[PDB]
Amino acid sequence: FGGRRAVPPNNSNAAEDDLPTVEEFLNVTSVHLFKERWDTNKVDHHTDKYENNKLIVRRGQSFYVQIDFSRPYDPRRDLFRVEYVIGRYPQENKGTYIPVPIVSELQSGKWGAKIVMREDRSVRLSIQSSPKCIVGKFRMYVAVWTPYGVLRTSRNPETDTYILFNPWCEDDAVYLDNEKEREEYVLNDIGVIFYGEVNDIKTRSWSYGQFEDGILDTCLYVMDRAQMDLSGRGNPIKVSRVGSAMVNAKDDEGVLVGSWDNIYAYGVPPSAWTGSVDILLEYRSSENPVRYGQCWVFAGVFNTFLRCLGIPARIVTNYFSAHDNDANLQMDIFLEEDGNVNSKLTKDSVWNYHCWNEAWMTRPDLPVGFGGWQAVDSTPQENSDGMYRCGPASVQAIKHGHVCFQFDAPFVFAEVNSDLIYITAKKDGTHVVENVDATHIGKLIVTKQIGGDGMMDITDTYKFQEGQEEERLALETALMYGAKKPLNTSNVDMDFEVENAVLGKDFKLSITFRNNSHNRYTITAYLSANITFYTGVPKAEFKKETFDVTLEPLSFKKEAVLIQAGEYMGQLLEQASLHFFVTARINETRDVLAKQKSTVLTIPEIIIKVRGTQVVGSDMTVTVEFTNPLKETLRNVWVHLDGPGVTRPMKKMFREIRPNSTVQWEEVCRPWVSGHRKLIASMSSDSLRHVYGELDVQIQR
Amino acid sequence: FGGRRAVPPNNSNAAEDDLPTVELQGVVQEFLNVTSVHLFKERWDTNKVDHHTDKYENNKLIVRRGQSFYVQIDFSRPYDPRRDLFRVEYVIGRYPQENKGTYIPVPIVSELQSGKWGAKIVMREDRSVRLSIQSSPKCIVGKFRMYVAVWTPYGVLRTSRNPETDTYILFNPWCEDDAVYLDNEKEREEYVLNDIGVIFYGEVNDIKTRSWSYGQFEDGILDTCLYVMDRAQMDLSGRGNPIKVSRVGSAMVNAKDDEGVLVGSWDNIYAYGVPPSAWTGSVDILLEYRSSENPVRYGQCWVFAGVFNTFLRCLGIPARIVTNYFSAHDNDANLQMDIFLEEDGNVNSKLTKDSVWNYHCWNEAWMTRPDLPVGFGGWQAVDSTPQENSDGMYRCGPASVQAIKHGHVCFQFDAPFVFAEVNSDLIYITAKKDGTHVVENVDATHIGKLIVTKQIGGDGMMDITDTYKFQEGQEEERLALETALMYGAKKPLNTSNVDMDFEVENAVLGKDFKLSITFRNNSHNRYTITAYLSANITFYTGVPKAEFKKETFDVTLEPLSFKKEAVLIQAGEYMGQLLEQASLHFFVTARINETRDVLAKQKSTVLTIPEIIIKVRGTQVVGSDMTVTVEFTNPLKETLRNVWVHLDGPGVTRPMKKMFREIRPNSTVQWEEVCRPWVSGHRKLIASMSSDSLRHVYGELDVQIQR
Numbered sequence A: 001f002g003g004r005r006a007v008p009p010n011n012s013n014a015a016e017d018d019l020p021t022v023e024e025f026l027n028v029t030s031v032h033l034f035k036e037r038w039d040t041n042k043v044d045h046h047t048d049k050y051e052n053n054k055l056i057v058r059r060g061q062s063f064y065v066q067i068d069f070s071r072p073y074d075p076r077r078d079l080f081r082v083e084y085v086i087g088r089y090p091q092e093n094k095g096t097y098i099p100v101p102i103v104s105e106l107q108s109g110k111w112g113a114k115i116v117m118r119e120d121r122s123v124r125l126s127i128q129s130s131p132k133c134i135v136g137k138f139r140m141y142v143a144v145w146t147p148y149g150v151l152r153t154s155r156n157p158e159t160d161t162y163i164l165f166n167p168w169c170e171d172d173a174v175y176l177d178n179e180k181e182r183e184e185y186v187l188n189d190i191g192v193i194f195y196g197e198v199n200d201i202k203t204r205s206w207s208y209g210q211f212e213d214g215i216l217d218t219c220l221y222v223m224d225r226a227q228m229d230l231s232g233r234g235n236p237i238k239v240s241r242v243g244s245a246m247v248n249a250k251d252d253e254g255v256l257v258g259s260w261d262n263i264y265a266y267g268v269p270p271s272a273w274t275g276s277v278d279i280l281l282e283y284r285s286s287e288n289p290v291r292y293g294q295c296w297v298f299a300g301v302f303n304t305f306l307r308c309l310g311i312p313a314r315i316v317t318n319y320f321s322a323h324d325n326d327a328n329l330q331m332d333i334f335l336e337e338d339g340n341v342n343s344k345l346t347k348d349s350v351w352n353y354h355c356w357n358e359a360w361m362t363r364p365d366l367p368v369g370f371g372g373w374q375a376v377d378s379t380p381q382e383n384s385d386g387m388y389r390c391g392p393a394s395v396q397a398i399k400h401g402h403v404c405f406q407f408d409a410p411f412v413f414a415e416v417n418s419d420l421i422y423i424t425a426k427k428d429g430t431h432v433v434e435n436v437d438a439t440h441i442g443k444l445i446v447t448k449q450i451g452g453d454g455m456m457d458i459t460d461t462y463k464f465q466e467g468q469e470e471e472r473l474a475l476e477t478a479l480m481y482g483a484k485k486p487l488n489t490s491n492v493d494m495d496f497e498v499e500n501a502v503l504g505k506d507f508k509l510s511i512t513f514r515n516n517s518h519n520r521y522t523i524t525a526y527l528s529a530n531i532t533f534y535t536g537v538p539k540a541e542f543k544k545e546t547f548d549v550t551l552e553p554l555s556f557k558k559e560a561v562l563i564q565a566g567e568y569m570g571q572l573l574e575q576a577s578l579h580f581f582v583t584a585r586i587n588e589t590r591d592v593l594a595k596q597k598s599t600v601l602t603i604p605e606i607i608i609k610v611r612g613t614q615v616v617g618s619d620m621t622v623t624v625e626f627t628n629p630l631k632e633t634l635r636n637v638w639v640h641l642d643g644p645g646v647t648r649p650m651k652k653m654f655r656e657i658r659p660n661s662t663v664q665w666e667e668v669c670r671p672w673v674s675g676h677r678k679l680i681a682s683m684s685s686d687s688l689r690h691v692y693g694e695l696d697v698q699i700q701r
Numbered sequence B: 001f002g003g004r005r006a007v008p009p010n011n012s013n014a015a016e017d018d019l020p021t022v023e024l025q026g027v028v029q030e031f032l033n034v035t036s037v038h039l040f041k042e043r044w045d046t047n048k049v050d051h052h053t054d055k056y057e058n059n060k061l062i063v064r065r066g067q068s069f070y071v072q073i074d075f076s077r078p079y080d081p082r083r084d085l086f087r088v089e090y091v092i093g094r095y096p097q098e099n100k101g102t103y104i105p106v107p108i109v110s111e112l113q114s115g116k117w118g119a120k121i122v123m124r125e126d127r128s129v130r131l132s133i134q135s136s137p138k139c140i141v142g143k144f145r146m147y148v149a150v151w152t153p154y155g156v157l158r159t160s161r162n163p164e165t166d167t168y169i170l171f172n173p174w175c176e177d178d179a180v181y182l183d184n185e186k187e188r189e190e191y192v193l194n195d196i197g198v199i200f201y202g203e204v205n206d207i208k209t210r211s212w213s214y215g216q217f218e219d220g221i222l223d224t225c226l227y228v229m230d231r232a233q234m235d236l237s238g239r240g241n242p243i244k245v246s247r248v249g250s251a252m253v254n255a256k257d258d259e260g261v262l263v264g265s266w267d268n269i270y271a272y273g274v275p276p277s278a279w280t281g282s283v284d285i286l287l288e289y290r291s292s293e294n295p296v297r298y299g300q301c302w303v304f305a306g307v308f309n310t311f312l313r314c315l316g317i318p319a320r321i322v323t324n325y326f327s328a329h330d331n332d333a334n335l336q337m338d339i340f341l342e343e344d345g346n347v348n349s350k351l352t353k354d355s356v357w358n359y360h361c362w363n364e365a366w367m368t369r370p371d372l373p374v375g376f377g378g379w380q381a382v383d384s385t386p387q388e389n390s391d392g393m394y395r396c397g398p399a400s401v402q403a404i405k406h407g408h409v410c411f412q413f414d415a416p417f418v419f420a421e422v423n424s425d426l427i428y429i430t431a432k433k434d435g436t437h438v439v440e441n442v443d444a445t446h447i448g449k450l451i452v453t454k455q456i457g458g459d460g461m462m463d464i465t466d467t468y469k470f471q472e473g474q475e476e477e478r479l480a481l482e483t484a485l486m487y488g489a490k491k492p493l494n495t496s497n498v499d500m501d502f503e504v505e506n507a508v509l510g511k512d513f514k515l516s517i518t519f520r521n522n523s524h525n526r527y528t529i530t531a532y533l534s535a536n537i538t539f540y541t542g543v544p545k546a547e548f549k550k551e552t553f554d555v556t557l558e559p560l561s562f563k564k565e566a567v568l569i570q571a572g573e574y575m576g577q578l579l580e581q582a583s584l585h586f587f588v589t590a591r592i593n594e595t596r597d598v599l600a601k602q603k604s605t606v607l608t609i610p611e612i613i614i615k616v617r618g619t620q621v622v623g624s625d626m627t628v629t630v631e632f633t634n635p636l637k638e639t640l641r642n643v644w645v646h647l648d649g650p651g652v653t654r655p656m657k658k659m660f661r662e663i664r665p666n667s668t669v670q671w672e673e674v675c676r677p678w679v680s681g682h683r684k685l686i687a688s689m690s691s692d693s694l695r696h697v698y699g700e701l702d703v704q705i706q707r
C-alpha cells in the first residue's frame, strides 16, 4: 500500500507522465514558437547564446507563440488554453501543472496568455509566466475544453520550453538592477580566479561555459540528482542551498571529489581544470563524481550552475582564510617560553586564499535589508549540521554581525573575521596569551571586475573598518548569535618582508626591529620557513634560523637573510607556497613579538598564439607553447586547452619535456561564437603543475 | 599528503591514540609513580547516586558534567606538595587537542572553581591522595579515557591505557550552569530518569495510549548512543552542544539508504522487516542497529520518536514525545491544505491528494538557546520524521517551541515547517468543468486541534496545545500568524447562515456504528440542501485507500432551526478492508441550492482493537523468578497467520517475542516466560501482537518489584 503520501515525490524534471489526449470543437494543427536565436523571443529573453534549439525564456516575462487550428477560433464557442507541465506527478497546487488562462490583459505576476493576433486559423499569443515560476524544462500542451471532456495536444518534444531565472524581470527575486552587472554576472561565460597570496596576487582564467551545448541540461540533472522537489526549483535560495550541496561529492553522489593530496592518483589534478564544462559533462556522462577538485574548482562549477540557470553569481577570493573555523574567532599559534613556535600544538592554519561564490537574490525570509549578494561556500567545513557547504549567508548580515539568520552565517563571518592569538605554552603545562592580531584574516577579499579581467576589491562588503564602532557593533552582535571567543583578551616593533621569486631563484628576506624606548634590549628572534600547501597546511621546515639581536634606544635595526633556491627546490608543493614565522622573545620583559607572511614562487606560463583566419565558422590554428625552464625532465606533461565558444576542452600529454625544451601543439579550431573570446590552457605533468596561460582572440562574424 | 587539514577530523569517540607514558625532550628517576586509581564508581556509592547515573546497567564510572566527583590516587610514595607536580587527564578520540576540548588536563587546585575543570586534593593518607574533580558544564559528552601524569622538568611521565578508568561524562539537567538545566526534580525525574513512556495515538475524539520502553539505562544503550554519533561522524567538539546533538542525532534516526537507525515504511505489508506496530520499545531496535551496523526495518513516526527520546534521555538531555492531532505534515511551509470539490458539492478525490494525519508524533528536547534572542529556550521541537524543509527531505528542528507560538520562524531550525504542522487551514475549493477554481470556505479549526504528552504524575495526558499556539480568535494569535507570514510561512491563496457539523460514534472493530449530521439554519430564509457523505478507509497518515460508503441526501432547512440526519454504518460495510490502525475518514459536504453556498466538514474514527492480557505470579523481587503470562484472544471471525507476540518491560525483561503460525477464530494463545527482574520499584510489562493481518495490538501490566 502507498501509505506515506498519496502522490509520490515530484523531484525529477527528467521524469514524465502521460497526459491523456482525451479527458468540430477546434483541434490544433501546428504550433509556432518563434524560437530561433535571432528572433524576438530568445533575443529579448536573453537566451540567444545557449547552444540549444528549444525555446528558452525567463520567468516573469512575456513571450510569443502561435497556435494554428483546424478552423478559426471564435470567442463565442471555443475554450482552450496552453498548459506547461513538469515532472512525473504534475499538480496545479504545487505549480507543476500550469494551465495558462486566456486573459484580456496580462496581469503583473501571474500566468496568462493574451490573444494578440487572429488571422484565418491562427492565433498569436503573448504568454506571461509568473515571476515565482519553477525553473526547469516544461512540456507544452494545448487543451480544448468541450462538453464531455477536454481535448489536448499529444506529446510534442519540439515544443519543450525552458523557463529560467530572470535577473531583468523586476518582479523576480533574482532581479539585478543594472545592465552592466547583468552581462558580467549572468551573460559572461569566461571568468577569472585570484590565487597566490595577498602580496603577490596571481590570476588565471576559467571557462564557465554555461551556454555550451549540454550544460543547461546537466544543470537540471544536477538537481534531479539531489532529488530536488520540483516545487522548490523556483526559489533561488533553495536552488543555491541544494545546489552547492551537490558540488562536493559526498561519497558517490555529488559532482566533484575533493582532494588536496598533491598526487591525485586515480584522477585529474585540480590544477589541471580549465573550466566547468568537461567536468559537468563528465558528471552527466558518467553519473558519478568527477575526480578531483578544490575550492576554486568547486567555485568554478557552481558559478556555471547559477549563471546557467539565471541567478547572477560571481566567485570571490578571500585572503588569509579561516576555514574549518567552527564559528570561533581565534586561530592559535603556540609559542615556547623560548619565543619559538611550538609546531606540535600549532595545528590550525589559515588558508593563503579561499574562494567561494556569491549569488544575487532577495531574502524575503529575512528582515529587510539583507538581499543582494549571498555568500555560498561549496567547500564544506563543520557547520551546525555537520561536514557541509555553507550558505547562502547574506553578505550584508555578515557585515553587520546578524549571524542568527540562515544559512551558516557564523562560519562565513569567522572565515573573514578571526584574529590570530599568540600563546605561550609553558614547560609546566599552563598557557599564557602573549599577543592578539586582529588584522591578518580576511585582509583582502577579491573578485573579477565588471568591465574586464581586472581585480575588484570587495573587502568592505563583508566587513567594516578595523577600530570604528561599526565593526565593533558587528562584532558584539555576532558574539550573541553564534560567534565564539573562548579565551579572553615593551615598545619594540618587529616586522619582516620576504621577497617574491621565480620558481628556482634565490630570494631575500628582511626583519626590522624598532625600539622606541629609552632602554637597551637583548632579544632572540627566530625564523621558521615552512613549505605549505595553499591551505596553509605545513609540509616541512626547509629553513630554520636563529637571530640574536641587541636593540638600543631609539634604534631601528634591520637584519637580512637569503633563502637559497636549493633550500626549497626539492620540496615545494603544487602552487609553490612558502610560509614564514619570525617570533622574538625579548629578555628583560619576557614579552613576545610575532609575525607571519606567506609567499608563493611565481610559476611558469603556457604560450598561446594564433594564425589563420578568425571568423565564426572559420578555421584558425592555435598553438599551445610550453618552455619548461627547469632542471628536471618532466614526465607525463599533460597540457589542456579550453576557450568558451572557440573550442571544447581538450588535453594532450607529452611523454617528457627535458630541461629548457619547448614543446608545441597546434590545434585547428573553428569558432561558433563571434566577438571577444579567449583561448585557455593549463599544464600538469607528474610533478610540476598549476601552470597556466591564455590568449585573447577576436572572432569575427 | 593531506593538504586539506593539518590534523584529521576527531569525529569518533571509539577511536583512540596512544598517549606516551614518557614524553621527554632535551637532556639529563623516581618522581612519583601511580600505584593505582580508585574512582568510586559502585552503583550504591555517592559518585553515581549523586550524579543520578546509578540506574545505568554499566560498571564503568558515569558522571554528569559541571558537578564534582571523587577519585583516589595511590602513589608510590607520599605526595609531597613541595616538589611533586601532577594532574589527571581526560582524552577523547584519535586526535585530542586542548584547543578543541578533547584533551583535558585537570589542574590540582586550592579550591574548585565555578564551571572550570579542576581537581582539589581533598585528602592525603599513606601514599594515597583523594581528589574532588569538577568538570566544566560545557564539557563534550562521551566516554573519556583517564590518565595521570607527573611533570618532571624534562617532559612528563604518565599512566598507561587502562580501560577500567574510562569515564562517561553526560549532560547534566541537575547543574544550574549546564545548558540543559531543568529546575525542579519532578521534571528531571520525568524527562530524564523515567525509562518508560506512553505514546498517544488514535484521533482527537478517541485518544489511544500504549506504553513504550525507552530503556536508556539497559545494558548496551549508552554505548549505542555514542555509536550513533560515531556513525554520523559527529565532530567530538560538537557533542557538548545539546542543540547540535539533537540536530545530528535526529537526522540519524531515519535511514536514508544504508545510513540511519530505522528504515521508515508506511506500506501495510512490511515484507522483510518487523512491522512498526510490533515494536514495544527502543531497546531491541538500537541493539540491532549496533550489531548489524545497518538500518532496522521498519519504523513510522512514533517509532522514530521513541528511539530518539531514548537517545536524548540516555545522554542526559531532558526529552518527551508529543502527539499532534490532525497534523499537516509535508506542508512546505504552506498554511493551506486543499480539498477540491466538484460543482455539485461532492469531494473531488482525484484532485484532493493532500491528507491530514489523524495524529503525528515528534519529540521535545529541553535546552537553552544562546544562539537565539532571549526567551526561546525550554522545549525545542525536533521531528525525525522527514519532510521537505529548506535543505531537502530531512527531519526538522530543534525549533524553539516559544518561537513557533509567536510566529518568530526566521530562527533556526525549520521553524516554518513545524509552525505549519500545527497552524494550517483546510481550504475547500471547487474545481469547475471549465477548469477554473473557486474558494468556498476555510476551516481554520481542524489542524493542530490537540497537542498532547504524558503527565509527570503517571500515564495520563497533558494538553500542551497552548505551548504551541495562543487561543483561537484573539490578538496574540493573529500577530503570531502575521509575524510568521513575513519570515517563511506561506498562504498561497487569499480568503447564507447555515452551519453544519457531525459526530461519529466510536466503535469496537467488528461493530456497527452511527454517524449523525446536524444543520443549523440561523437565518430567516428557508433553504434546500443536498448533502454528500463519503467514508474512506485510510492510513493513520490520512492517505485513503477506498471509499467504503457514499450517501447523498436532500434536506429542507426551515428558517431558524436544527435538522439532524442519522446514518448507520454496518460492520459489513468496512470489515474486510481496514489498514493497520483501523482508521476511517468521513467527509460531509453539502450545497445550499438558493445561494450556491458550500458547507463542508471532516472527521476520522479509529476502530478500537482489543488488548493483549498480561499476568504475573511468583516472587516479584529483584533477582527472584516470577512467571509472566501473556495471552491474546483472536477477536476476528477470520483466522490469523504468523501471529507474533512481543513482551517487554525495562528492568524486568529484555525484549523478546514468540510466534504462532495460526490462531483460529475465537481461539486464545498463551506465552509464559520466567523473568528475573533486576530493577525494583514500579515497573511495567508491555506486549504487542502483529500478524500477517491484524496488528497494532498492545497490552501491559504494572508490577511492583520487591527488593
Ligand SMILES: [Ca+2]
Binding pocket: A416, A417, A418, A419, A438, A439, A440, A441, A466
Ligand atoms: Ca579582523
Ligand SMILES: [Ca+2]
Binding pocket: B422, B423, B424, B444, B445, B446, B447, B472
Ligand atoms: Ca488554527
